[PDB]
Amino acid sequence: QQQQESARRENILVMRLATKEQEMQECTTQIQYLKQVQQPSVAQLRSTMVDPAINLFFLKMKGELEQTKDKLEQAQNELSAWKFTPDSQTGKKLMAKCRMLIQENQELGRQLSQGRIAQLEAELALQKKYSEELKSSQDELNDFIIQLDEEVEGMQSTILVLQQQLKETRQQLAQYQQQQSQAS
Amino acid sequence: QQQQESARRENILVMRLATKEQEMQECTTQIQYLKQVQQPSVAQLRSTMVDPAINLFFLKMKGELEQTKDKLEQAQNELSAWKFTPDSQTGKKLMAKCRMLIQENQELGRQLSQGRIAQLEAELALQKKYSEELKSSQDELNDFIIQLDEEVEGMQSTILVLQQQLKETRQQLAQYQQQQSQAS
Amino acid sequence: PLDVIDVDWSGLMPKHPKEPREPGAALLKFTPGAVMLRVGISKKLAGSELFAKVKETCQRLLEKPKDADNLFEHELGALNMAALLRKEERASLLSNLGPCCKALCFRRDSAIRKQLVKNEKGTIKQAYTSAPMVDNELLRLSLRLFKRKTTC
Amino acid sequence: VPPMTYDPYDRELVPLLYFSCPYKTTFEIEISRMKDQGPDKENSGAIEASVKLTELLDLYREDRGAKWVTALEEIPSLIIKGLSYLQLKNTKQDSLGQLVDWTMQALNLQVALRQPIALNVRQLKAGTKLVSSLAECGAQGVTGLLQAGVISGLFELLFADHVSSSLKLNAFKALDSVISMTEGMEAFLRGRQNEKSGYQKLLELILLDQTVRVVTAGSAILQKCHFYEVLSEIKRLGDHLAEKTSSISEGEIERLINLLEEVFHLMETAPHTMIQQPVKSFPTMARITGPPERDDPYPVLFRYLHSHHFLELVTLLLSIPVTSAHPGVLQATKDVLKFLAQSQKGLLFFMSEYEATNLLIRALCHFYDQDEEEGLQSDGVIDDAFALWLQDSTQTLQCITELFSHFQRCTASEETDHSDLLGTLHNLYLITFNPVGRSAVGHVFSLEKNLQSLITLMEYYSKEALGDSKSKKSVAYNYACILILVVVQSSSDVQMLEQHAASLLKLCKADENNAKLQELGKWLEPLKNLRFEINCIPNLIEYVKQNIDNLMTPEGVGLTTALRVLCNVACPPPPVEGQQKDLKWNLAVIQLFSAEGMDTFIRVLQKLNSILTQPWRLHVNMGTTLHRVTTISMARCTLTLLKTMLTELLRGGSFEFKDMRVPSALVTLHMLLCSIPLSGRLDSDEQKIQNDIIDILLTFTQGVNEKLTISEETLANNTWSLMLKEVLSSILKVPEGFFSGLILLSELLPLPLPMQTTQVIEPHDISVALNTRKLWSMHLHVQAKLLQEIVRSFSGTTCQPIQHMLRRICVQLCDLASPTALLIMRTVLDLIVEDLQSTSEDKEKQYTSQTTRLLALLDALASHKACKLAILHLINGTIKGDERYAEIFQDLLALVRSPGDSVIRQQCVEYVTSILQSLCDQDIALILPSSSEGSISELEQLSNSLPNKELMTSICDCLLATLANSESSYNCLLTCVRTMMFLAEHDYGLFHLKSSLRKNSSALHSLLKRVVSTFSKDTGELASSFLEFMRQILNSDTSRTMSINAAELKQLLQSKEESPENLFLELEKLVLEHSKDDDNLDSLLDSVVGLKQMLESSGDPLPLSDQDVEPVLSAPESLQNLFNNRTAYVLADVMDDQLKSMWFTPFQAEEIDTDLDLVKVDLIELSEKCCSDFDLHSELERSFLSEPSSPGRTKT
Question: In this structure, is residue B9 part of a structural domain?
């Protein structure tokens, strides 16, 4: 019909209006962000501390300072290495530092060995085997619980049957010794 | 029915959509201005206000950078003076090895804490904990099964006593009938 | 200067060396007293005699005469359970932290401090600082609806 | 055309249409469906049951044999369909009555023992199942059972001897099915007269030693009985309030608040303590046995909440002025409503009580209006928009019903209704414009096959318009696309995808040219061939690891899903009490370590902050709410994964985790997300992110035993000390991270002692609270060299937040133990002594505004217990290198006793006088004063809380010279007379005050001349304090054993030959203040006429005594001993104001914000060539903002 497609196009138009309204709402929220009347203190902090110029210059100065510091480290230790003689105090302490460094490097290479990784994987496989053994014990234990429940139900049925037998024979013997004590 | 007023609603919806899209364009230009205009140039970059704490940071870093640079130049001038000695070359190679070990030891310590061995020890501890929790709850399930089997043995004792009572009352009825049929 | 410090090392969580359990000691928290403590009973619909008997069964399970005679002071059941849970939570506020548990932090310490300042009944009363827009039309509608529902 | 503008509260709820009520049982649901829907051919499955059900009820009318037992075993499968058809067809021989009598015959033990062996207990079990299936049959069936005596019938099997424990579990299931109806619960709580009630029978049954699962079922019945009872007491209190307000103690209102929080806490732990566990499920601490299937207790907690009109009660409580005024009532009822609105059942509860829900939405929206109408709503009363959230949640579920029940109509007919479908989709889309409305839409479609609505809508209109458009755009298809896109984007509970990830993907594959459907496909990519189990988290980790490069990028947005699905299936929900731990949450963590997870979550965090760091600096701050919600969801999910991994690894015994990428990435993610919120207060999700960051940073403080603290070699390499290094050395790294590192280091450290308790803390817990602080101090004294740099760098700043956070840390971190206390205080004192030196020599000290800020820090520190004693043990003069501290204190005293006249020195003298006041205050100490016996003696509590002899002499000299010198300010004189009032409370302080008055004898006289010379109505406070101090020296002559009479007091006041008439001046002006004003003048002339009556009581000229003996003080205990024996708790029912001062934001508009920022003009460009040659800063800074201004992955 004519009003058919007329209302269909009206639906498409209100769809476009809704999506444009969503975009306008997003832009309005972003305005409320950018035109927020923030606290004086948070504005103070944003302007003084996270200002990109001051912050980037701080980065550059820290980097240059640490570069110069490690360069001075390199130069000073190279000096003390030129001043190295085997029985010097700095000499003994330096070869001892290198020796304990070799010790620590041997230790670290040991803790990273393929032998240590193999022992750790063996322990992990052993623990996984133990956990699946516990799961198998758990299945055994579940079946034991099922057996116990089935047999207590059977025993309760047996008790009820025995109580019925007992009541029957007991009332029989009672009525008998009663009505036959009635006979002289 | 008629399409006139519905098409009128359609085209006024179109003009509403045009107004909304132009408001959205205004919002986009406004947020672009608000978010991109702030850029500091040499004009303000040469008259930046900084906190007293940040200025003290800059002054401390400048001062200690100057001191470290001075000691650095001094040490590197002293480096050019020292002449080649056998023990000096021994110390040079010794401390080259010392540096390389200083670097390799941290490169290996980060592997020991972020690599395969850390994941393996974590899986191992977690599997140990999982198995210990599974077993610590299977112990409670074993105590509850002790409860159930005590129930079993109690019901079995009751079955035994009821069976003895049924037997004695049944033989009592048999004998009382065999007597009081000829007597009573 | 800057005095030498050492710590007595006793805040670690209990059962750390984990000495093995006694056979038949997992059904110890399922005795009548231990169950009634976790559940709590109500005096107004358990009766006088039965409430007395249950409180007696619970008392001889508690080892602290303070808590033993502070048992079940409310007439509601869930309120008794909540009072016991609050007693145990207050007792466990500072007991589980330190060496082998996560050390104290600002959030957790603030929480346990706001817990310590709460008296029993578990609440510190807030003072009025604001009030809603009293729309007595809404109040009339609410009262009418509540009464209608209470009737049918 | 629908209104594209949205007023959220204009639409209101109507009765449910598609989803059955949550409290209705299956029988009632079936009978209502067959009633209203009429005689459909769904009757078919009914009749073959019904005619069968009546063929068993007419075949065993009086037969009770084995065949009857086999019929009992069959009846429960026919009561749902059969009995309902019978009851609604009104073909009634009272088949329900015959069923109830069958049930009473079956539960009978006498009838039971007359059966064969295999099936005498089968009859009892079948009668139990009959109870359970007939109580779930409406008021009709449950009252039929109750009248026939089912409670005292079930309590025959439970009390009989020699009965299977499985049969008792069955009888308990039957009893839980009876009392799940409110008629049953009423008959169970209040039994017949001259009989024990069901509750009393149950209590008597538990008091016999029962099997573990039997007493657990008893506990599960008792918990539900207590819940019903709490609800009944709430209903009683509410009806009381209704009758009292129609035509109220604070005690009963606090009781109502307690009952409401009790209802909340009972509904929270209900699926663990109110359900009947299966007969094979034991209550072990970790579920290992029995079926996994449990039955949720909410379909009966809602029957209770409905039979007691709980929503009407909360509507009243929120609409009645006296109770609504309480914040406790609002918060406690909002807890319950927010819990109800979490689940599909609870959300259908609100829509069943649609009238009560409308009125409740109104009563809740009134609060959220007045909140910003009178308050500012950032740190006062909390605002979470719960009114709007609940309105939009119930509205979107109403639209879900209107959208489901439009496909129950197009398959029983064909489409004659399209416009209402489209209007529903539109009113559902408009809700997704807010962030709260969008969160509610994403949360409601994420509940129990609700997403199936839009899914089947798109499956329909993809066979009608070839998807998007065949000859018509089929706008409903586009609405459904947008909706199933916003729910996938915004939801964080990703369980909904578990069953739909297939369908949606097919949809995403059925239309490859739809701009929204292919984005949805990118969102669902990690769910191709996935199963949401702990065996496929290796695949999810492989996905997160394979395209980690695309994080804030629309082509790697599906990674977000791969971190929600991976947080849904591997992170246990926050555990509630009474819950038995499931063991898969262990395996889910093991599999989360096997497939490398510590690596590919550290990498997620690292790339997350490497992406966010540039918009953070450029102040874009996650603008578009879509990108913000995805980045917050990704951060929170990665943090939850890391938190569960570390807290599950580090609890499995004492383990040591030294990755050191986790803290270095977290102290940056905190800076980027949680540190500087432009609102000045963290959000909810950002607060959760900060809490997760602090928890992960604290999991490095576990596993620290004696064997890890013997030597400084094994202490500085400990995991605690490594985390502390990565947190501290990340504070002085970049000025952007200053405030973040501070607001984080202050969340790691514990609050300062003493604890304000209502009751005593047993010595073990105070020992633990002392030892955890000793341990924090032991681990901080290795980073002492960074703590000193922190308190040297920020001390002397004008940024109010950083200043306040440093001022807070220096109290938290100074109260841990003696070493760190002396560390912080030595640093602050060295800082002030090098600020007073290094600029002054051969002359007086130069005081600048840097000195002013430094003294302000020292002041606001000295007013705390630990910091003040750390000052005292440095000024005292026992030199450990501490001579300069005593010298600088003498220099500060010289400053105050000779202020000169400036605006800087007149600003520093008030700070040093506040210092002096905090030093001479005995209510500020580690050993707090207490006249309770068995404690420290009074005179030995001042030897450890006041200056020593030669320091107290100088302090009294200074406090007098600052009164004599009339150049002093007003606040200075106020704090000095306050310090004098403090010192005038004991013979030590008063002896020194008098002995100093013997040198400066015109101190109080000139002070009184100052009081009268510049008196005003605001100056009255100084006069009041001075007259209080005056009385405090004569109140004893009509605590201390040595005071002055009125005679020599007035002699000290006697320096003018009109000083009595100076008192007369004060009097005549005092009555002349207003006589038009407050209680100032009458109290003040009371005091001063008392003083002048003591004046006339004696002759004035009397020299002050000299025969008095000084009360000597013992050696001050070493600061370590004071920190050892410190008051760890005080009996007070209110928080200390100093502790309460640490809870509000560090962002204060201006109360610490200095009017003189001393912002030093610095020329940055010249500071390049003076250093090593560096880039032109203009180029570097313009490289960042030219093109890339949108949030997320940008140029740099």
Answer: yes
> What is the radius of gyration, based on Cα positions, of chain C?
23
Resolution in A: 3.0
| A100 lies in some domain | yes
D513 closest CA partner among D481, D547, D550: D481
> Quick check: bond before D754 cis, omega within 30?
yes
Domain that holds residue B11: 1-34
Query: Are the CB atoms for D480 and D454 separated by under 8 Å?
Result: yes
Q: Which amino acid is located at D480 in the chain?
A: A
Query: Does residue C44 contact residue C75 with C-beta atoms inside 8 Å?
Result: yes
Tell me the residue range of the domain where C107 lies. Answer: 32-122
How close are the terminal C-alpha atoms of chain A, in Å?
112
Please spell the DSSP secondary structure of D525-584, one letter per residue: GGGTT--SSTTSHHHHHHHHHHSTT-SSSTTSTHHHHHHHHHHHTTSPPPP-TTPPEETH
Q: Is residue B162 part of a domain?
A: no
Under 8 Å between Cβ of D659 and D625: no
- The dihedral built from the CA positions of residue D409, D414, D416 and D418, taken in this order, carries a sign that is positive
Q: Cα angle at C67 between C62 and C73, to 5 degrees?
A: 115
Q: How far is CA D368 from CA D319, D335, D339, D373, D381, in A?
A: 13, 15, 19, 9, 10
In whole angstroms, give the CA distance from residue D786 to residue D729.
7
The answer to whether D586 contacts B129, with C-beta atoms less than 8 Å apart, is yes
Dist CA D977 CA D1022 (whole Å): 8
For A81, A85, A92, B95, the CA distances from A88, given in Å and listed in that order, are: 11, 5, 6, 15
Asked how this structure was determined, the answer is: cryo-EM
What is the SS3 assignment for D475-541?
Answer: HHHHHHHHHHHHHHHHCCCCHHHHHHHHHHHHHHHHCCCCCCHHHHHHHHHHHCCCCCCCCCHHHHH
Q: How far apart are CA D537 and CA D159, in angstroms?
A: 50
- List of E strands, C28-120: none
List CB contacts (< 8 A) between D652 and chain B. Answer: 125-126, 128-129
Cis, peptide link before residue D22, omega less than 30° from 0: no
Chains linked to B by 3 or more Cβ pairs within 8 Å: A, C, D
Give the bridge partners for D1162, in sequence order: B48
CA-CA distance, D1054 to D1031, in Å (whole number)?
17
Cα–Cα dist D969/D908, whole Å: 11
Locus of tokens 């002359």:
D843
CA distances (Å), D1158 to each of B92, B99, D800, D906, in order?
52, 46, 13, 17
D720 at interface of A, judged by CB pairs closer than 8 A: no
In angstroms, rounded to a whole number, what is the distance separating the alpha carbons of residues D519 and D517? 5
A137 found inside a domain: no
Residue C4 lies in a domain: no
Q: How far is CA D643 from the centre of its chain?
A: 18
A-contacting residues of B 106-135, CB under 8 Å?
Answer: 108-109, 111-112, 115-117, 120-121, 123-124, 127-128, 130-131, 134-135
Verify C-A touch: 3 or more CB pairs within 8 A: no
Tokens representing D741 are 């590192």
Q: How many CB atoms lie within 10 A of CB D7?
A: 7
Q: Which residues of D touch B35 (CB under 8 A)?
A: 619-620, 623, 1189
Query: Looking at the 3D structure of chain C, how many domains does it have?
Result: 1
The answer, for B167 touching chain A at a CB cutoff of 8 Å, is no
* Selection from D729, D792, B67, B58 nearest residue A61 by Cα: B58
Give just the sign of the alpha carbon dihedral D822, D825, D827, D829. negative
Smallest CA-to-CA distance from D777 within A110, A115, C2 is with C2
Question: In total, how many domains does chain A have?
Answer: 2
* C-alpha span between D761 and D755 (Å, rounded): 9
- β-strands B48-50, D1160-1162 pairing: antiparallel
Q: Best residue in D485, D621, D736, D1170 to probe A by mutation, most A CBs within 10 Å?
A: D736
Contacts of B140 (CB under 8 A, 6+ apart): C26, D282, D284, D285
